[PDB]
Symmetry: C3
Subunit: 128 residues, 3 copies
């Protein structure tokens, strides 16, 4: 399938059978990260990535791109676990310009420092 | 677009570039709140709002309207971050009567006390 | 409606008006559980169930089936609260083979020990 809309953003984060069933107590890390048009942190910011993930002693990720720029106004929410420096995550929600949008995002992670840059390539397959 | 179904509920909660990337440890607050047809807490209850949000030292919200009334039987789930006394949040899931439903909700907050009344105006744009 | 695709999996977990508005601090339990084709833990594993739930002192559940088998390659994510030994939960996300899929799952719980087997019956009503 070809997507009815493609978007690319970067956001910047600073840290600080077979196997049996496995549980543990979790701790939540909450983040609020700048989203930029290109790779550099000092390139134009177009919103904030806000969400959370988990440490055990944690493939789980929930976050929203809160977009607020001259061309993009809305939110896109993603949720799920995926264990490669690259993973897919489902679009799970949309508001504003991204009202009723659906699709997937490919997340590529440049790890450096406590500095992580995440390339997020959004392919929408339903667009309103 | 005009919604194929509109619903209005209130639920009642009782408490107790630019910026750099920002993380912290989070704490979860879980809530289980009555949903009513109208503004007053003592008006007919039609279900419970059950979910969680986060304190840092937190625009993130995940919750489900568990509806159980003479006219509404099902669940509606919402998730996302939005930083106005009014915000939008995406429908992310539905069961029962709201099976395969999609759309957005506008949330208006009356803050008082530790008492918060939230007006939730659901506009579905896909209805089964 | 008849589903365009039906799937059945089991996963195995090992523990260890009216009512006023109710909140509390929550603690998160994270789990990573084997998914099998049939009831027995020693039957073929087809992936891992990875997500979290909450203890108060908690009908909330978020998890992803990370499927990795000879016939199924993708993820399916579910989220929501539902208070019966059986409950429904909405599909909220999909990737890979389950890209753009939507529907509901019925979850049946066999409680034993700290051992819980969950029968998950997925009915997709949108398939790509």
């Amino acid at each position: 399938y070809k997507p009815c809309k493609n978007l690319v953003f970067y956001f910047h984060d600073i840290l600080y059978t077979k196997l049996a069933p496995q549980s543990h107590f979790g701790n939540i890390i909450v983040f609020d990260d700048p989203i930029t048009l290109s790779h550099s942190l000092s390139s134009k910011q177009v919103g904030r990535a806000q969400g959370f993930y988990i440490y055990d002693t944690t493939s789980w990720l929930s976050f929203t791109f809160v977009l607020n720029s001259t061309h993009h106004q809305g939110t896109i929410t993603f949720a799920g676990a995926d264990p490669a420096k690259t993973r897919d995550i489902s679009v799970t929600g949309g508001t504003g310009d991204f009202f009723m949008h659906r699709g997937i995002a490919t997340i590529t992670t440049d790890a450096f420092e406590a500095y992580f840059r995440l390339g997020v390539y959004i392919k929408f397959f339903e667009c309103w």
